[PDB]
Amino acid sequence: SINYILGLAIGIASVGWAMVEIDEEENPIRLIDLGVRVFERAEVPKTGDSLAMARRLARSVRRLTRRRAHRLLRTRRLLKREGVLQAANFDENGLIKSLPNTPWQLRAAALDRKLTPLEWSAVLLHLIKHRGYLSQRKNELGALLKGVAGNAHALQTGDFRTPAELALNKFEKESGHIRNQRSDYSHTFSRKDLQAELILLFEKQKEFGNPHVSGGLKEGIETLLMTQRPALSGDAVQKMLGHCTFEPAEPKAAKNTYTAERFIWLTKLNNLRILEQGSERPLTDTERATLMDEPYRKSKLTYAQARKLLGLEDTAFFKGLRYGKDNAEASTLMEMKAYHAISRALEKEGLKDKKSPLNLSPELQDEIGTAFSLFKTDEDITGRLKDRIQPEILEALLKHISFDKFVQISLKALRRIVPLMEQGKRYDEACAEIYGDNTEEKIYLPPIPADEIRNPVVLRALSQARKVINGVVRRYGSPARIHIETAREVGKSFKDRKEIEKRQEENRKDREKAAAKFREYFPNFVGEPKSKDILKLRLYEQQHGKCLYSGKEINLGRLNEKGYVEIDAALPFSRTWDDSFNNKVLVLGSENQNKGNQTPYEYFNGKDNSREWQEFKARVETSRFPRSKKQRILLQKFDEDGFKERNLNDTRYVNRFLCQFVADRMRLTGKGKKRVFASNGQITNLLRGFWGLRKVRAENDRHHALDAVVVACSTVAMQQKITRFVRYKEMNAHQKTHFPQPWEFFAQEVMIRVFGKPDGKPEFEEADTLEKLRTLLAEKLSSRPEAVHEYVTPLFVSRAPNRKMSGQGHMETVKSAKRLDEGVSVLRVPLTQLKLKDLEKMVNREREPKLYEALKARLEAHKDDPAKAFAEPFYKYDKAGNRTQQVKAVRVEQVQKTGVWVRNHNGIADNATMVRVDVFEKGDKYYLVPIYSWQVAKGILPDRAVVQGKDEEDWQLIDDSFNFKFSLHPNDLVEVITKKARMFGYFASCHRGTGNINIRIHDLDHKIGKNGILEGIGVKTALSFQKYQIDELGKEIRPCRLKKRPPVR
Amino acid sequence: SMFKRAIIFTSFNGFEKVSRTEKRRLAKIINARVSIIDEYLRAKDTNASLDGQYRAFLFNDESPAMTEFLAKLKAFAESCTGISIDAWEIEESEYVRLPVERRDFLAAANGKEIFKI
RNA sequence: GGUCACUCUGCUAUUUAACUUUACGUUGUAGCUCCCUUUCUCGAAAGAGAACCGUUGCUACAAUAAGGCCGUCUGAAAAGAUGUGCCGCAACGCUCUGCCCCUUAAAGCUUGCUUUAAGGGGCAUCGUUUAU
DNA sequence: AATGATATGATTTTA
DNA sequence: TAAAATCATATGTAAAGTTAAATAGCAGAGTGACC
């Protein structure tokens, strides 16, 4: 039963963890254990897009394709049933045999003649397949809207009857094509326009003979062309709604609701403040009674109108209004959007007269608002409220109303509160008067609730942190306390993280330039200019070359003279724990003495508003300091403990949730309320510096554990030791002693435990094994007998396995598989993408040499930029020099040794995801069988193993003469002993062409391999090839052996 | 390590319009000398940053940095025919002995003028 | 009057989750068409006319993950009819089901190991989000 | 514009 | 020459709409600790 603090450095792809044993006074005494869990960010690696978003987009295009095909099949069935075509016209699959491929011509010429069975059917099928866009808005523009509106205006203008006629006349003549091109949106029509064309076509063909203008046919065809499912089912909205603040049973009310709108208006009114002459006051009862009914009586309330109604004055202004903005009082103060919306609907539909109140009950307006906000289809709203209001009103409202956006409070609670607020009480007073003002703790943390954290990346980080927490609890019992350091990147969007990367790169460049300038100013400065020296110079210039405490001029040139100038913490660190740059000032060594642990307000006796305080305040106000810094330096009355806490704790939303959750839902045997503690990153780095652990030069994943260790030693007792030391240092008072450390030789112990090498030199050969590590700690830390114990094992990085059997089937581009007998595919490539290397592989290189030479010359002319070379159109010339036809894409050959059949077995695509590799042994040689996701989908268990030189048909066949050893998934731990070296890593990728494997070194040390990856390990002639098991915490590494070959299922 | 200060005043004289080109040129000349140490001196190609502004550049002498800077400024000003630059020099002692408010005007008054173009 | 956390309102920015459509792009097949390699025919030449095959452009139709299914009615069924028809590249989890690891029993060949069982965990081809 | 990680042709090195 | 390393190169996209939730900044009203 061990007293230990669990430190966690929670990154966006890693969780470093440490266990530090503690005293009876929460003192760090012994480093029990440490490790690093590493995993994949829960986002698309290339773009940062949501994984669920890509999945949803794939699903939605699946639905679109399915429903379009179903629409066309239904239309064919209807054409058969309405006696337009006979069974003779349809092929075995179910398609019309040899239907005319000119439905645009047949459409635009259906205005002049009768149509055959085929021509009519083709026109209908083409109209339904290409049915344009339907405005789904409730009611600045992109290509789609501009094109649709342009075509709508063109056919509405005259000289064109139907969009097909307009299309042929305009688009073909002026473009050379009717349908839209790569990024074009010009030739796009409104669904309303095509429906009009449909009704006109039916009536015209009715007169033009044409037996098949049946009512049934017309109705069916129109229904098929016009109908599409509703975006909101009629149950979605409640399913996404969320509970009330006060009554979790009741759901929150809609904004467009008399009660909720009244609540918003009462909040705004009761919270309004007015500033007259240096004073602040609320609106009086008579002022409030003057304004209350006005938003119902006017379109908008308008702060300026409120001023008019109260006859306020020119000297009186509204609080919280940017009056710099030129017509600040033109802002809407209140607008009963729902009230006036219902009113205007009934007014425009002739059931309401202007200058007359709404005749509907408050409850009725509530019902209308909630129904419209919860339901967006006529059927649903009707079924909900066609029972309780007149149908005329319902028709008007369905014609004109659109409501959204709920108000966080239930109608019940709102109805209780709104009278109480009506009689002049504030919101807090009302709900205090009505309502005044939790979960059992398990041993193991429960799953992180996705409801609270919506960032999937943060969700995965926290889930892996849960895995590590539960691991250390399972292994060592309940922790006494949990200390957390969430990275700055956890909880931010992809763009925010990219922005902070860009800004830190720019900061590195700026610091390089600043060091160069500092060197220019001080040619004889000794050594590299460190951050404190650049900061000294910056503070000099930014303080106008004046001592902040005294105002005496500072002598540049003596800047580096020891003790001449000090970078002082304005607020004492013993009392504030603030090491931010907003608390550092440049003072003369002379004057910053007898200052001690006082603040500028206390040092200069600002309590009595002395001359010195005013002078100091003027100095800091005139300086080039951000407002935050000026506010901090001039901090008058403050709380010691509170300020220490805010600087120590780091209360971003993920940290807040994490602390709350872990403390409330997991057993911790600690002293006092705060048994979960999230650390300020700046203070963690400060302690890291003072405790002796430099920023490691090496690139690997182990430094995370280092951070965790430091977080584990940020105990209240350690913190107060630091506080006492810094207080003494402030008062200048047991000789060179130094910053307090958790224990003697803390730095070296931690460095050896994390990296397996001494602190100084990273070129020592790592203590790869338990006994070697223990020998290293015993030798280098002989004074510390507690450095060696039964839990000391080398840090092995645990990598989250990924044994999912489902994935992308194939790449999304489909290539011609006609010529697959020879190892080639043919893909058709736009000229704006064609390159010399690609051009060498054009199918028609041999046939049409002139075109090839012209293309080559055009690419050479523009330094081989395909976009620039082919910005102006390219044409195939025809013996005599006359440009003939245009070229926009050409067929190119590509190598294709393998692939996946798609599109009714008429196309081929490259593989996407290798889900498994089965490992067999014959004789004393190893064989690998790859299994892709499409093989899993089709249910096929491959039987051919890889041979380097050959294609799959010449591959080694597997039968009962082969032992089956195991199955590898990505990130499975493997051992390869090849009589040249032993390699122990995580299986990353298998190479189909070579038969080699790639393995990641546990810590991804860039020294070994290609950025930590051993690309190209052969296994066929290996002495041993084995698969292992590892746990979160990177412990219990065991060999494992499968009995039978697993199915794909 | 004797420190001087080059005070420059940049303005538009109205005779000829100032191209975005020339604005970026002058901004590049200025920003070559700015860093995080004196990032309040940074120049944008806006009229605000360029037209009618005082900038005091810190320099260590016994180094031809100041002279090259002033030469580039003078060349640009004479080439631009539509932008006026005035350059003064003051010792850093004198400069920090001046009051903070209206410091650059006082430094131009109390310094040695180098060129008015 | 500061600091921190919390409740509500408004504006703004960003993200998360779901849904409904459009329009291209890619492959296949046509129809017409642009070039063009073989080989014929013709021609003083230029270069026409044909037949595979390649292939430019335009228009249409099919497919648009690889793969699985549903409600009803005809049929012995294999199939027909019919549908605003439904799933399928992710995340999380351990209730059920696999695999693997560990621990503990019991029986055994000779303590070591192998089974078998339970318990604990890890991960899934298992479950939930998740459908008619 | 890339932003990443996987799949795999092509080529060089090793034993 | 087979097997094991190394180098190298390709990856579907853009318009429109209806929703709900979460985070954060600012503004306004409070509640609770402290200074």
PDB file of N, CA and C in Angstrom, chain A residues 306-343:
ATOM      1  N   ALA A 306     -35.397  54.513 -26.938  1.00  0.00           N
ATOM      2  CA  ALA A 306     -35.557  54.469 -25.486  1.00  0.00           C
ATOM      3  C   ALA A 306     -35.162  55.800 -24.861  1.00  0.00           C
ATOM      4  N   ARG A 307     -34.044  56.370 -25.319  1.00  0.00           N
ATOM      5  CA  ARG A 307     -33.632  57.695 -24.873  1.00  0.00           C
ATOM      6  C   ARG A 307     -34.724  58.724 -25.123  1.00  0.00           C
ATOM      7  N   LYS A 308     -35.346  58.676 -26.303  1.00  0.00           N
ATOM      8  CA  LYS A 308     -36.432  59.604 -26.601  1.00  0.00           C
ATOM      9  C   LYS A 308     -37.591  59.414 -25.629  1.00  0.00           C
ATOM     10  N   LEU A 309     -38.024  58.162 -25.436  1.00  0.00           N
ATOM     11  CA  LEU A 309     -39.184  57.900 -24.585  1.00  0.00           C
ATOM     12  C   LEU A 309     -38.940  58.317 -23.145  1.00  0.00           C
ATOM     13  N   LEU A 310     -37.711  58.200 -22.658  1.00  0.00           N
ATOM     14  CA  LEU A 310     -37.452  58.594 -21.283  1.00  0.00           C
ATOM     15  C   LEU A 310     -37.016  60.046 -21.157  1.00  0.00           C
ATOM     16  N   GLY A 311     -36.855  60.759 -22.280  1.00  0.00           N
ATOM     17  CA  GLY A 311     -36.393  62.137 -22.249  1.00  0.00           C
ATOM     18  C   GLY A 311     -35.128  62.202 -21.429  1.00  0.00           C
ATOM     19  N   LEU A 312     -34.178  61.315 -21.723  1.00  0.00           N
ATOM     20  CA  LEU A 312     -33.142  60.996 -20.753  1.00  0.00           C
ATOM     21  C   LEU A 312     -32.294  62.225 -20.436  1.00  0.00           C
ATOM     22  N   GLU A 313     -31.352  62.570 -21.325  1.00  0.00           N
ATOM     23  CA  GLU A 313     -30.659  63.857 -21.405  1.00  0.00           C
ATOM     24  C   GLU A 313     -29.469  63.690 -22.341  1.00  0.00           C
ATOM     25  N   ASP A 314     -28.763  64.770 -22.674  1.00  0.00           N
ATOM     26  CA  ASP A 314     -27.540  64.600 -23.445  1.00  0.00           C
ATOM     27  C   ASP A 314     -26.388  64.139 -22.563  1.00  0.00           C
ATOM     28  N   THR A 315     -26.469  64.407 -21.258  1.00  0.00           N
ATOM     29  CA  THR A 315     -25.446  64.035 -20.292  1.00  0.00           C
ATOM     30  C   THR A 315     -25.531  62.582 -19.835  1.00  0.00           C
ATOM     31  N   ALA A 316     -26.625  61.880 -20.115  1.00  0.00           N
ATOM     32  CA  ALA A 316     -26.823  60.516 -19.643  1.00  0.00           C
ATOM     33  C   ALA A 316     -26.607  59.535 -20.786  1.00  0.00           C
ATOM     34  N   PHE A 317     -25.857  58.468 -20.513  1.00  0.00           N
ATOM     35  CA  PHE A 317     -25.536  57.462 -21.514  1.00  0.00           C
ATOM     36  C   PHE A 317     -25.837  56.068 -20.981  1.00  0.00           C
ATOM     37  N   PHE A 318     -25.940  55.112 -21.902  1.00  0.00           N
ATOM     38  CA  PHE A 318     -26.179  53.718 -21.553  1.00  0.00           C
ATOM     39  C   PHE A 318     -24.866  52.991 -21.283  1.00  0.00           C
ATOM     40  N   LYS A 319     -24.869  52.155 -20.249  1.00  0.00           N
ATOM     41  CA  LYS A 319     -23.689  51.374 -19.904  1.00  0.00           C
ATOM     42  C   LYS A 319     -23.489  50.234 -20.893  1.00  0.00           C
ATOM     43  N   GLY A 320     -22.230  49.926 -21.182  1.00  0.00           N
ATOM     44  CA  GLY A 320     -21.909  48.807 -22.053  1.00  0.00           C
ATOM     45  C   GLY A 320     -22.219  49.053 -23.513  1.00  0.00           C
ATOM     46  N   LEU A 321     -21.975  50.269 -23.989  1.00  0.00           N
ATOM     47  CA  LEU A 321     -22.240  50.662 -25.366  1.00  0.00           C
ATOM     48  C   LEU A 321     -21.007  51.363 -25.907  1.00  0.00           C
ATOM     49  N   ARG A 322     -20.476  50.867 -27.023  1.00  0.00           N
ATOM     50  CA  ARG A 322     -19.328  51.525 -27.626  1.00  0.00           C
ATOM     51  C   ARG A 322     -19.780  52.816 -28.293  1.00  0.00           C
ATOM     52  N   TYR A 323     -19.743  53.925 -27.550  1.00  0.00           N
ATOM     53  CA  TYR A 323     -20.164  55.213 -28.091  1.00  0.00           C
ATOM     54  C   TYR A 323     -19.168  55.796 -29.084  1.00  0.00           C
ATOM     55  N   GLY A 324     -17.968  55.222 -29.188  1.00  0.00           N
ATOM     56  CA  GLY A 324     -17.031  55.655 -30.219  1.00  0.00           C
ATOM     57  C   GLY A 324     -17.548  55.371 -31.631  1.00  0.00           C
ATOM     58  N   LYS A 325     -18.527  54.474 -31.767  1.00  0.00           N
ATOM     59  CA  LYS A 325     -18.875  53.824 -33.029  1.00  0.00           C
ATOM     60  C   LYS A 325     -19.770  54.639 -33.972  1.00  0.00           C
ATOM     61  N   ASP A 326     -20.150  55.890 -33.638  1.00  0.00           N
ATOM     62  CA  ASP A 326     -20.924  56.718 -34.571  1.00  0.00           C
ATOM     63  C   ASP A 326     -22.287  56.097 -34.895  1.00  0.00           C
ATOM     64  N   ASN A 327     -23.316  56.451 -34.100  1.00  0.00           N
ATOM     65  CA  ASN A 327     -24.669  55.855 -34.089  1.00  0.00           C
ATOM     66  C   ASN A 327     -24.680  54.544 -33.306  1.00  0.00           C
ATOM     67  N   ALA A 328     -24.105  54.598 -32.108  1.00  0.00           N
ATOM     68  CA  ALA A 328     -24.105  53.441 -31.231  1.00  0.00           C
ATOM     69  C   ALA A 328     -25.513  53.134 -30.733  1.00  0.00           C
ATOM     70  N   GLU A 329     -26.360  54.156 -30.598  1.00  0.00           N
ATOM     71  CA  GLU A 329     -27.704  53.945 -30.085  1.00  0.00           C
ATOM     72  C   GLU A 329     -28.679  53.507 -31.166  1.00  0.00           C
ATOM     73  N   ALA A 330     -28.211  53.292 -32.399  1.00  0.00           N
ATOM     74  CA  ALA A 330     -29.070  52.709 -33.421  1.00  0.00           C
ATOM     75  C   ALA A 330     -29.172  51.202 -33.264  1.00  0.00           C
ATOM     76  N   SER A 331     -28.427  50.634 -32.316  1.00  0.00           N
ATOM     77  CA  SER A 331     -28.483  49.203 -32.076  1.00  0.00           C
ATOM     78  C   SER A 331     -29.850  48.799 -31.548  1.00  0.00           C
ATOM     79  N   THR A 332     -30.307  47.628 -31.984  1.00  0.00           N
ATOM     80  CA  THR A 332     -31.596  47.122 -31.540  1.00  0.00           C
ATOM     81  C   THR A 332     -31.506  46.778 -30.064  1.00  0.00           C
ATOM     82  N   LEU A 333     -32.406  47.343 -29.270  1.00  0.00           N
ATOM     83  CA  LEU A 333     -32.406  47.038 -27.851  1.00  0.00           C
ATOM     84  C   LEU A 333     -33.284  45.832 -27.570  1.00  0.00           C
ATOM     85  N   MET A 334     -34.377  45.704 -28.318  1.00  0.00           N
ATOM     86  CA  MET A 334     -35.228  44.530 -28.236  1.00  0.00           C
ATOM     87  C   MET A 334     -36.123  44.485 -29.466  1.00  0.00           C
ATOM     88  N   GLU A 335     -36.387  43.272 -29.936  1.00  0.00           N
ATOM     89  CA  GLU A 335     -37.259  43.059 -31.086  1.00  0.00           C
ATOM     90  C   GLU A 335     -38.012  41.762 -30.845  1.00  0.00           C
ATOM     91  N   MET A 336     -39.316  41.869 -30.582  1.00  0.00           N
ATOM     92  CA  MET A 336     -40.150  40.690 -30.365  1.00  0.00           C
ATOM     93  C   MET A 336     -40.328  40.026 -31.727  1.00  0.00           C
ATOM     94  N   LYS A 337     -39.301  39.270 -32.123  1.00  0.00           N
ATOM     95  CA  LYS A 337     -39.266  38.690 -33.460  1.00  0.00           C
ATOM     96  C   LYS A 337     -40.447  37.759 -33.690  1.00  0.00           C
ATOM     97  N   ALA A 338     -40.756  36.910 -32.708  1.00  0.00           N
ATOM     98  CA  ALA A 338     -41.851  35.954 -32.861  1.00  0.00           C
ATOM     99  C   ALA A 338     -43.201  36.658 -32.929  1.00  0.00           C
ATOM    100  N   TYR A 339     -43.454  37.571 -31.988  1.00  0.00           N
ATOM    101  CA  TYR A 339     -44.696  38.337 -31.977  1.00  0.00           C
ATOM    102  C   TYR A 339     -44.939  39.025 -33.315  1.00  0.00           C
ATOM    103  N   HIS A 340     -43.997  39.876 -33.728  1.00  0.00           N
ATOM    104  CA  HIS A 340     -44.154  40.615 -34.975  1.00  0.00           C
ATOM    105  C   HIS A 340     -44.152  39.694 -36.187  1.00  0.00           C
ATOM    106  N   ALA A 341     -43.482  38.543 -36.106  1.00  0.00           N
ATOM    107  CA  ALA A 341     -43.488  37.604 -37.224  1.00  0.00           C
ATOM    108  C   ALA A 341     -44.869  36.991 -37.419  1.00  0.00           C
ATOM    109  N   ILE A 342     -45.470  36.494 -36.336  1.00  0.00           N
ATOM    110  CA  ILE A 342     -46.841  35.987 -36.398  1.00  0.00           C
ATOM    111  C   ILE A 342     -47.782  37.080 -36.888  1.00  0.00           C
ATOM    112  N   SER A 343     -47.632  38.285 -36.327  1.00  0.00           N
ATOM    113  CA  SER A 343     -48.485  39.404 -36.710  1.00  0.00           C
ATOM    114  C   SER A 343     -48.370  39.695 -38.199  1.00  0.00           C
TER     115      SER A 343
END
